[model samples]
Target: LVPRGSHMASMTGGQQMGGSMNDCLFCKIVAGDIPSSKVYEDEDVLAFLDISQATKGHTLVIPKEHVRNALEMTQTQAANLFARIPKIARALQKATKADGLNIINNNEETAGQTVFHAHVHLVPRFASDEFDIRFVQHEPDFTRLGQLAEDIQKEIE
Candidate 1:
């Protein structure tokens, strides 16, 4: 029989991305040291099926270059990585017959980012699926929102 916890760790780089050459799971997958059910592959990016089927057709897209996470990616790097998503997403939706899709990237540990590498989660949704992400409502803090927007805008390049 298969080891009980083996499958748990097999998902190493499937959803999250980026790791050093020595130990990064997704990096190995990209390098072909580990196996992946690749969905799409190009010079700058790689897309593959997630081991955990959070939903059918769940896929992870990652840059070939190792960047700790999106927070560490350069503008050009981020641009190249994101530019490939729409087409991949469209193809996945059609292949899976999904009613809708969710594109997600968890940037840090606190945000549920398990893998250090920058990767995007493309989850295809169906009307009967159990997958759900709750967006609880919070009181609007208009003053704080304005300050936050201005602070972020000032930092934009």
Candidate 2:
């Protein structure tokens, strides 16, 4: 919302734009239009406890400003948010007394990104309950991977 109107206001798909808050769930929370317990909030981002705990001390950290997802975020924005992660993670660990935690970022629908406000979930895992995440490894396709890298590199310029 800097300078009255930045392109990001409307760049996050149809979540709302025009330098004014729409019906975004997180936006309302950020503007104090909604009620939620604030875990850690700076000018750059806000971290709050989830209503329902996926595990012990489940939390969601989001930007005070809006962006659909990581793709819409500027590098500076990403860096600031990421830089705060370790601090938040360590604090959450001590607060919940969990052995470890899972940092989940579901960026797309296929990846289970329902809330499009671009947030990262810090789910504390004591002994790994039903929140088991699965992983499937594929054999390396070095040729295709290299070509894909090349294609992406071409666009980086």
Candidate 3:
């Protein structure tokens, strides 16, 4: 199924204003106003190589529409983008002969989101690559763990 709001969804050549689409770099890329080293594209999504190669086959996949971030995505929007991620990731892995793959989706600034548009980063890992994540392991707080899970689960509805 085609994703909603792809047609005429900022195909105005960036001449129009008022919405975030005009300022969105991803939207311009989707509209063909800006050039992109495209890897894959469907009716409602686009995947392209990142200018800054964290690893050799670093890529960014995004929705055609200008959603703020993944947290803002509706059910269908998230499904449309995520369903194709594995295919794209596998392609990158094979093409780059990667040892592993990191599929990262950063939501806000605190999460390392430099771009406002909702996107997934596919960083293909090599044996001795520069791309690395610094994860700080936190000691488990058993006292609040149960209540924390319940509290967060409450927001699922």
Candidate 4:
């Protein structure tokens, strides 16, 4: 077992608002008050091998702060979290010898986001595994899709 309080400390400018560290699992993990199978750590983020691997070389990256979900994250916080993703994904790809990978972030309960803590799943895809990201296809209304994309893009901007 990993030593207690040995994980990475919380990142600057990513401090969470309105919550005690005791109530947040990610905070505990960040503070090293809890145990986790950590794979990578920096002053700003932590990447760990998931206890349950959805695929080979599956990893989860998270900010040290206790953001409930993606929507709660600030633009800077999101940038900090995602900035390290490419490196992590590349490392996992080489380690697993995967042909490709998928970065998935599910938000809200309806989208299968079980953990309240914000995390990004890096799932390596193997050719032999025959993993297809497109499982369902609905005929697209290009006009509606474009309109929705424009509206959402405005909000992000």
Candidate 5:
């Protein structure tokens, strides 16, 4: 689905996004070459119900433009994607009647990133469900935290 005079136009100037497009599943979905239960779609992003359904109403939001992982997202793309999530999540919560929601994104294989395409998962959480995501807390090193914050802040300045 290449939109005329859109981002697809630039991409169609002979180059493609992502490292590998011929076999990318999300790419096919974005192009309408494959089938998926689309939940949310706009000019910037496309969301669909996850087939595996980690839980009811589990949806995956992905950029219409291909991105290999979170690390590859541009600032504008991130802004555009996030600006739409709250509304999507709110609607999903209302539709599913879930207590809460958890948005997750895995960057790489080590962090359980099965899909190479950068996508966000909206997981509807219910009190009765058996979810095993443990929020383990270790003693925080305040000094390390401060230093890390300062180091990251300096880059922004």
Candidate 6:
């Protein structure tokens, strides 16, 4: 059962409008029903350290609203959620004293999305770490890649 005044309910999977918050894990955390290593919070969002850190000072930021995923997000919701990313990134950099940071989000199973709700990950990086953000494989066809790029650019023009 979920406790009152928590955001865990909004973070769990398969929840929709008027859904029961009792089953939401993020609602529990937001409501104080569950404890988290919180780093930041505001009227519209909450930022916290990842329990299982991939690197030093790995943080997750989520919206206060209970939108299920990116597919359900509105323009204002997306803007508001992403607007604070740069600021949060800066804060994490300062807090961790790291040389750089990487901000990322995954949408589906193929993209490595574990959480159901829409959230951004801020990962602090150091020069000494062997982590590589570069893509492992290059496209087999340069002609196909060029054609794809041109097709996308045409849409903008």
lDDT of each: 0.84, 0.80, 0.83, 0.80, 0.81, 0.76
Best by lDDT: 1
Clashing pairs in 5: none
TM-score of each: 0.81, 0.82, 0.84, 0.76, 0.80, 0.74
- Could you tell me the TM-score of candidate 1? 0.81
Clashes of each: 2, 0, 0, 1, 0, 14
lDDT by residue (1-157, candidate 6, tens digit) is 3243444333333344563245667766767778889988988888899888888999988887766556557777788888888888898999889998988877767777766667788989997766557678765698898999999999759
| 30-138 per-residue lDDT for model 1 (tens digits) | 8898899999999999999999989999999999877767766667878999999999999999999999999999977888988877889999999888898999999
Clashing pairs in 2: none
Q: Write down the RMSD of all candidates, one decimal each.
A: 9.4, 4.8, 7.2, 8.3, 7.0, 7.3
Q: Cα lDDT for residue 136, model 2?
A: 81
* lDDT-best of 3 and 6: 3
Q: After TM-score superposition, what is the CA distance of residue 29 in candidate 3 from its true location, in Å?
A: 0.4
Number of residue pairs clashing in candidate 3, backbone atoms closer than 3 angstroms, sequence gap of 3 or more or interchain: 0
- TM-score: which is higher, 1 or 5? 1
lDDT by residue for model 4 over 1-157, one digit each (tens)? Answer: 2122324323332235543445777778888888989889998899998888888778999988777667667788889999999999999998999988989988778878887788999999987665456678899999999999999999869
After superposition, the stretches of candidate 3 with alpha carbons farther than 4 Å from their true spots are 1-20
lDDT of 5 at 146: 97
Whole-model lDDT for model 3 versus the true structure? 0.83
**Model 1 C-alpha lDDT versus the unseen true structure:** 0.84
Candidate 2 lDDT, 1-157, residue by residue in tens: 2233455444433334445356679888888888997899898889999988888789999987777778667777678877888899999999989888998777778888777688989988885577777888899799999999999999878
- Which window of ten consecutive residues has the lowest lDDT sum in model 1? 8-17
